[PDB]
Amino acid sequence: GPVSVANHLGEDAGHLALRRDVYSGLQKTPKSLPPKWFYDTVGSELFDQITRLPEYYPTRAEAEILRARSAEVASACRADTLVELGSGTSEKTRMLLDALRHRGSLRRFVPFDVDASVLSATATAIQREYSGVEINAVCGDFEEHLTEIPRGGRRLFVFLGSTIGNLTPGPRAQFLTALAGVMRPGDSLLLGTDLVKDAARLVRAYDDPGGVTAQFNRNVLAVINRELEADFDVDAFQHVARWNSAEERIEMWLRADGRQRVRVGALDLTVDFDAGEEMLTEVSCKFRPQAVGAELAAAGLHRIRWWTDEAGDFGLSLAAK
Numbered sequence: 621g622p623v624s625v626a627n628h629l630g631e632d633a634g635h636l637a638l639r640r641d642v643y644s645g646l647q648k649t650p651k652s653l654p655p656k657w658f659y660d661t662v663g664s665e666l667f668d669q670i671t672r673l674p675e676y677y678p679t680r681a682e683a684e685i686l687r688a689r690s691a692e693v694a695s696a697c698r699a700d701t702l703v704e705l706g707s708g709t710s711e712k713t714r715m716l717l718d719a720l721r722h723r724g725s726l727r728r729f730v731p732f733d734v735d736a737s738v739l740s741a742t743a744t745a746i747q748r749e750y751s752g753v754e755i756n757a758v759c760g761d762f763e764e765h766l767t768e769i770p771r772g773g774r775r776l777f778v779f780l781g782s783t784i785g786n787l788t789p790g791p792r793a794q795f796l797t798a799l800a801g802v803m804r805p806g807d808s809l810l811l812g813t814d815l816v817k818d819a820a821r822l823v824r825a826y827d828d829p830g831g832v833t834a835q836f837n838r839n840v841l842a843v844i845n846r847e848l849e850a851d852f853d854v855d856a857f858q859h860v861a862r863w864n865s866a867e868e869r870i871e872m873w874l875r876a877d878g879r880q881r882v883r884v885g886a887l888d889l890t891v892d893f894d895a896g897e898e899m900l901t902e903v904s905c906k907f908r909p910q911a912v913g914a915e916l917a918a919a920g921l922h923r924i925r926w927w928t929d930e931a932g933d934f935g936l937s938l939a940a941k
């Protein structure tokens with residue numbers, strides 16, 4: 621099938637965005653950085669390791685559901701077009717593509733992500749694996765370019781991994797509203813949400829004894845040091861995973877041990893850390909079944925299927941426009 625890739629981001633858009641997030645985030649109280657910047661090359665490779673840890677159940681729990689339910693996804697949505705809000709590199713992507721193709725309705729794959737080189741590799745992989753499928757990769761970001769997704773016949777939008785949990789309620793409602801805005805009647809959204817559960821299990825999933833998550837978290841400082849000529853003493857920042865009971869979310873923090881002064885050279889910026897000051901690097905909201913259905917409703921989408929894994933650890937929602 622034909623491949624296309626459309627790039628709506630400027631060549632330096634990634635670097636401009638990083639400059640903005642860091643100039644802004646290192647000046648908030650508390651300091652905070654968005655989790656999208658964990659995922660450079662080293663960081664993406666560390667994330668792969670995390671998904672294979674015994675502590676980190678979300679990846680396998682979601683794959684367990686999709687292994688068992690992809691055909692039920694395919695029969696309810698009846699999509700001819702799979703839109704992945706993501707890079708399309710995972711096994712789950714092929715599980716859904718396999719199920720739409722088993723149905724015979726699969727015509728088009730639309731991976732939508734911010735890294736055009738990954739999208740190009742993904743498009744070549746799918747083109748080699750799925751004959752007669754057209755791939756229309758779209759390089760754009762959520763806040764501007766969701767309108768540039770092709771119309772197709774009937775579209776299944778896919779947002780897996782409980783990545784929606786990185787948005788707190790305010791931004792999360794804005795995102796779901798905008799996504800529902802670009803969907804057309806007859807489209808559907810497959811959404812993965814990690815579920816509230818025993819808090820000790822949740823912390824463990826974000827602070828494995830082997831230290832992999834700690835290295836993943838510390839890597840954002842390495843990314844800033846490298847990309848913006850900074851002098852974070854990375855090992856002076858301790859990994860801290862917290863359960864926030866009242867907000868029902870995991871939080872990843874980096875805790876300064878002793879006072880630190882950090883100079884970000886590209887930004888002409890100097891910031892100060894108190895001894896014990898913690899900086900927020902990721903929010904991971906955990907959900908309850910009924911609240912996910914209500915948040916989808918508030919955005920204009922109607923949930924028509926809900927599936928958990930055998931342990932009730934992880935949820936998949938299918939919601940139609």
Ligand SMILES: Cc1cc([C@@H](C)Nc2ccccc2)c2nc(N3CCOCC3)cc(=O)n2c1
Binds near residue numbers: 654655656781
């Ligand atoms: C390409 C990519 C990007 C992410 C980052 C950008 N997210 C995000 C999404 C919207 C807004 C802000 C942040 C990601 N986040 C994942 N998460 C797993 C569950 O716990 C924490 C979040 C998994 C995973 O594959 N991502 C893959």
